[PDB]
């Protein structure tokens, strides 16, 4: 025995990769056969399952998250001026997939807006999204590739890899304490 390749921990659920211990743990974080965890902000929920199962999980356990059909919508976040750590979530359905639209006000204050595909990293690469804030002869735009829920959004948000704005920018675009984000999804 010159050396040995070890199977990925998720080999049981179908990973055929075999690797030397050195880069086993490296593969096992990237591995696509890794179960999906709950993609809602606030991890009061600790559900796991297969990708097929996720949409149903949200449909049963997160009924208050609501969905819109369209490749162009307006995500109207209400009570934008609420103090402290706030979340806004909704779902956008188009091109046969479901996307999670997230806004996060963090405490210091700063807002972060980002879109994730309910799908795989490879699938996420087929899509682009635009976020845009609008006011009288004023527009702020963000354009990026959506993250797979597999990857999540937490590190993106930490790295400011998304639309970022502060409370004062919010006031240039907010009407009656509500902010309208124009979300547009497309293929590429």
């Amino acid at each position: 025995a010159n050396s040995v390749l070890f199977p990925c921990k998720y080999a049981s659920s179908g990973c055929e990769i075999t690797l030397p211990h050195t880069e086993k743990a490296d593969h096992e974080e990237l591995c696509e056969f890794r179960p999906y965890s709950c993609p809602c902000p606030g991890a009061s929920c600790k559900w796991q399952g297969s990708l097929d199962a996720v949409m149903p999980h949200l449909m049963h356990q997160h009924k208050s998250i609501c969905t819109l059909q369209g490749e162009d919508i307006v995500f109207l976040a209400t009570d934008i001026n609420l103090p402290g750590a706030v979340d806004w979530v909704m779902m956008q359905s188009c091109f046969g997939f479901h996307f999670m639209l997230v806004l996060e006000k963090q405490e210091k204050q700063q807002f972060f807006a980002i879109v994730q595909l309910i799908g795989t990293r490879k699938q996420a690469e087929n899509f682009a999204y635009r976020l845009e804030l609008n006011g009288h002869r004023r527009r702020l735009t963000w354009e990026a590739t959506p993250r797979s829920i597999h990857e999540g959004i937490a590190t993106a948000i930490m790295n400011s890899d998304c639309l970022v704005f502060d409370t004062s920018i919010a006031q240039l675009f907010a009407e009656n304490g509500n902010l309208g984000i124009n979300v547009t999804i497309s293929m590429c």
């Binding site: 369209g70 919508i73 307006v74 995500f75 109207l76 209400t78 009570d79 402290g84 979340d87 509500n178």
Partner: peptide, 13 residues
């Protein structure tokens, strides 16, 4: 474009 508007209610952590 033809744009459906959806109102999203906040959740405080």
């Amino acid at each position: 474009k033809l744009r459906p508007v959806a109102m999203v209610r906040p959740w405080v952590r």
